[PDB]
Amino acid sequence: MEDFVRQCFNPMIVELAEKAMKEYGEDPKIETNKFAAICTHLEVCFMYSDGGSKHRFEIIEGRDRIMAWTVVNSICNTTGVEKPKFLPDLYDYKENRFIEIGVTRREVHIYYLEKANKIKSEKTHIHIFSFTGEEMATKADYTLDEESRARIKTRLFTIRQEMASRSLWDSFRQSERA
């Protein structure tokens, strides 16, 4: 599983995931499903940012804390958009809203509710993906076109397939908590 992540995710994603884990005092070499999840979520974040036109999204996920809030506060100032309680993952310049992107090994509707309840926002859009084709976005507005979405859902499927080929999937599938 450690080998699978090192192999299937690019080196910048793997370094970010390491740093995030070590900041909570966890060891990527032992909490390898968490490691994998983090990498997976980051890749989805970047993929999604690339689904727009050229300048459509601002990436927030993947940045250190000071920079991430610098971006967020700067947007809130230059747009009147209200200030989220938690860092989001993206800002959408076209829809003028922050996005929270979830990637779940469970079911999309449950993770959506959990995410909605943790956020406190009538205003941050939430978009959840699974490894088996499901999405659930706020007010059924999936933001990107179906082809962008499909490239994301397919990549997640491919990840799941690759894990299962290495017998990592059962364990990975069962590692996410409420």
Ligand SMILES: O=C(O)/C(O)=C/C(=O)C1(Cc2ccc(Cl)cc2)CCN(Cc2ccccc2)CC1
């Ligand atoms: O869950 C997501 O889909 C997500 O994008 C989470 C986040 O960005 C974090 C902020 C957050 C975002 C949304 C919600 Cl509901 C709760 C917290 C900040 C960095 N995160 C860094 C981190 C990841 C894993 C282990 C330690 C730290 C944790 C929560």
Ligand SMILES: [Mn+2]
């Ligand atoms: Mn985030």
Ligand SMILES: [Mn+2]
């Ligand atoms: Mn997210």
